[PDB]
């Protein structure tokens, strides 16, 4: 159970040490930040695009080293895409989801991929 | 229901703002233009090649961001390839199909991929 | 003196047999056609972007086989960019320039790159 | 004089329509925000890495179409690196620099690369 | 029914005008030539490697433009790999197979891929 | 039945003459060496990552030339990943497995891929 | 003095153990063989294209490991291009040049790149 | 003065957190170890190849973020190549050189590239 940064932006406590990964993460934080300012279609498209792109790249990176925790990781990802495809305006959920996902699921692959 | 450019060439009203996409689109317009001048095998091969190439690239681009409207988009594409594989000389259909596809189906992915 | 297509569009007489080159050429015909319809900034940008890109790609293809005619060919490309960058609205010049360039300068690399 | 976002995060007013460019820009906003929270070595490293990378990638994109404004644009980038490399802690300068750069220097390549 | 070159080497009558394709073809001719000089394991490995590599690349090239005659083309390829995997020393067959395959099946994709 | 190098490091008797392959092999030897010094999680992650990466690359290389002994080779690989995913501390097995795998299974693809 | 193959085709005595290099070499043997059958423009183009390409690729491979013999090796390649570019029809020279080059200059990079 | 591993193999104390860099480093330890077992041509070739390659790759990684320490770092690499190219058999020097280089010069780019 991790703190929710305020303002909702990436900080170095989220570093995975995979610079590509971290840079993509920065875009998810920003995506959620925009929704938190105006829940509209431009903002959701922006978050949705970045999310889909990051999840697939990250998935690719896991596959490249035949990561053993892939399947569970991909299912987490897919659930979240799914929430975005049926967006309900629950910004709070999203803020929480990302913090947790990174600090628990992503942090797990460090050193194995 | 959009106007059919005359001569049948790409114009900036078709811009998707994905330069690779737009450049490929220019080749589909030209492909249909040739058929409209001489319905022969050279012209149809030319259009067919460009169409198959563009549809797959565009499909790839959609997949890279796990675009939610992929499946419907790919089925549209496949139907059209199919018409080209059973070419009937209906140039009018083709002129119409492309204008519409771009301005309705392709324009839909803008900002999401 | 090669004939100037009317409408000013690519035809199979311009084929180089390098599909990537041919698809790019189609974009240069389109760029000149748009300027002939309306000599504005959007149209010139489009043509200028496609030209710079095509010239560099073709240059790279020449370099990959250490093509003996590279220097002279690069100089010809560069002279045309210069014309685009100091654009005077002479569409006639451009229409002629492109037809001639493909049919006499580009046609000379066929089989050598 | 463009408005300085507060919190200092990317918004869609900064859109260039080049998704890769936009995602990188988001990382530069984040880098400046972290320094505004704490002017330390980690934060500066992060910003410096993202900046060097973005500047080189954008430069490459400009080169790929032989963009006529390249030289002047590269010089502007280089002047900012210099500022990062001789960092004096002037966060205000940086916040202004980035907003201005995107909205007047980067916006000028749109449609040309 | 085409002539069998003697010596068994590639000639320009086999040009497909896809330089990558032609260069790979040259290696298949050489592969069969070696077997024709000494039917041993080194020579067959050499032909087998080149064959497998060429067939997959060529297949990839067909897929890139969603070539309509792919399936029939791939099945031809697979039959031949199969003969190589159960090599019987029938060099005559191999000499014949390749000449025919190129001049009938490969020549068919020209202009469509 | 091959000797187990002591110290457990790669030597030129293991050369496959595929430099990429050999360089990756060097990392598997090192991975097993670390486990042999301290059976901990850091060391096993390190070996596991390198193993998964090498097996997939090698598999890719085999596929590129449609290697006939792929299926048997991939099943060997997968069994070993499997032992790593259920690590028992049997370092002896691992030392043996690798020496053998390289000198018997990997040496088999030489000249065919 | 290495023996000149007759027919003038690549054999496994020319193996470098770099499959990409070996496949390219096969194209250079073929190019010289065609010229020995008919000293014309098509044949010379073919050889000249394959040579320029091979020389640049091999050069790149040398550079990737910072090969200490690069300069001298590049100079040898360049001298041969020069001969192709000022072609006098001396097929004998070419047959000798290539055999010697591979067996004494290329063989020296083996194990170093 | 960092401790010299014995046996002379990579350990996790050398981690840079760049997996590609770490895997390459492992090859440099191995190269020096082989020379300590037998100071011959094969061993030196191996080390020299791996070194040239690693130095260039790491250099490229530094350039991709316009790393401010590049020049000085390149000079250090080049001085070592020089030592390998004028090899005197001083294994002691090499063992020390590598440990020191990683732990003080490479460690300085962490977080910046």
Swiss-Prot record, chains A, B, C, D, E, F, G, H:
The keyword Repeat does not apply. Hemerythrin is a respiratory protein in blood cells of certain marine worms. The oxygen-binding site in each chain contains two iron atoms. InterPro entries: Haemerythrin, Haemerythrin_Fe_BS, Hemerythrin, Hemerythrin-like, Hemerythrin-like_sf, Hemerythrin_metal-bd. Belongs to the hemerythrin family. Fe cation 2 binds at residues 58, 73, 77, 101, 106. GO terms for molecular function: iron ion binding; oxygen carrier activity. It holds the Pfam family Hemerythrin. It comes from Themiste dyscrita (Peanut worm). This is Hemerythrin. Transmembrane segments: none annotated. Fe cation 1 binds at residues 25, 54, 58, 106. The lineage of its organism: Eukaryota, Metazoa, Spiralia, Lophotrochozoa, Annelida. Keywords: Iron, Metal-binding, Oxygen transport, Transport. Homooctamer. It comes from the Eukaryota.
């Amino acid at each position: 159970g991790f703190p929710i940064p305020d303002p909702y932006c990436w900080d170095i406590s989220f570093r995975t040490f995979y610079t590509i990964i971290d840079d993509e993460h920065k875009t998810l934080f920003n995506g959620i930040l925009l929704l938190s300012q105006a829940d509209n279609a431009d903002h959701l498209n922006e978050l949705r695009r970045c999310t889909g792109k990051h999840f697939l790249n990250e998935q690719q990176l896991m596959q490249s080293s035949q990561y053993a925790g892939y399947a569970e990781h991909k299912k987490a990802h897919d659930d979240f895409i799914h929430k975005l495809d049926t967006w309900d305006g629950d910004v709070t959920y999203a803020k929480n989801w990302l913090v947790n996902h990174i600090k628990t699921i992503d942090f797990k692959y460090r050193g194995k991929i």
